[PDB]
Amino acid sequence: KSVPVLFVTDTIVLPGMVVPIALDDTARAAIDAAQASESGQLLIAPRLEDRYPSHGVIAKILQVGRIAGGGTAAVVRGERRAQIGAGASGPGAALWVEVTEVPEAEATDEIKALTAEYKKLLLAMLQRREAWEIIDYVNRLTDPSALADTSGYASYLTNAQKRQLLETVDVTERLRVLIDWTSDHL
């Protein structure tokens, strides 16, 4: 399964997040490519360093629009993690990658304990932010991955940390590292 890929340097999109992305040359190429395709699918991947990243997030383009400063951003919603395979030039002038579905994770009882205690630290950290409205939603949230998502929007995590979350398909590994980073709130 082949999709146009857009590399981000300044956000990270995890499954479920909705983010604007300022479109550079490479990026509008990808956006154009995705809007032509059957599926409209867009792969969102962290910074290219010396290798294709192991994983990106399949995303749906919500809206493409001009923004302050004369440039354009695309609003995208992350849908699911995908493993990145082979690359090629493709339709349009986009970079195209073979992707495959990640396996979904069964609800281990220790995942539920990890998710429970990450939720406790998150609510404290949100309470420190006076993010009262978000505390409302986070209270109703039980989906570990969807909860693990929340930290993509966190301003106290580096984009390197967030990339490490993206590339960690293991939920119990994700929750644990999130517990550590969120537990840095002295």
Side-chain angles (χ1 to χ4, degrees), residues 6 18 22 29 37 39-41 47 49-50 66 78 80 93 96 119 125 156 158 160-161 177 181 185-186:
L6 178 161
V18 163
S37 60
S39 46
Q41 273 172 345
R47 181 51 211 153
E49 295 189 343
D50 62 22
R66 77 311 293 164
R80 68 192 181 269
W96 286 80
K119 185 156 164 161
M125 197 58 204
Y156 56 95
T158 56
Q161 276 160 336
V177 85
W181 303 345
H185 78 297
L186 177 81

Side-chain angles (χ1 to χ4, degrees), residues 69-145:
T72 51
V75 174
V76 315
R77 172 176 49 232
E79 281 169 348
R80 68 192 181 269
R81 280 179 174 77
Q83 198 163 353
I84 287 158
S89 47
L95 180 53
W96 286 80
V97 300
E98 295 279 296
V99 294
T100 56
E101 35 174 356
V102 301
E104 261 157 300
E106 174 155 275
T108 298
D109 230 315
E110 72 141 357
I111 274 168
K112 302 179 185 234
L114 287 177
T115 294
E117 55 202 21
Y118 169 47
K119 185 156 164 161
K120 286 171 89 85
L121 299 171
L122 184 67
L123 287 183
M125 197 58 204
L126 287 165
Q127 175 136 26
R128 161 180 293 193
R129 184 145 57 92
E130 291 173 349
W132 304 122
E133 176 177 12
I134 296 160
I135 280 167
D136 181 339
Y137 303 128
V138 172
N139 273 113
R140 304 179 199 279
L141 268 175
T142 56
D143 181 355
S145 303

Side-chain angles (χ1 to χ4, degrees), residues 15-39:
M17 298 182 63
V18 163
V19 278
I21 300 172
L23 304 173
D24 65 19
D25 286 61
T26 321
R28 185 88 210 225
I31 289 311
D32 284 341
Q35 283 183 340
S37 60
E38 189 266 335
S39 46

Side-chain angles (χ1 to χ4, degrees), residues 156-157 161-162 164-165 177-184:
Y156 56 95
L157 295 192
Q161 276 160 336
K162 303 184 182 192
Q164 173 184 348
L165 285 167
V177 85
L178 276 167
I179 276 155
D180 290 344
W181 303 345
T182 296
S183 182
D184 293 321

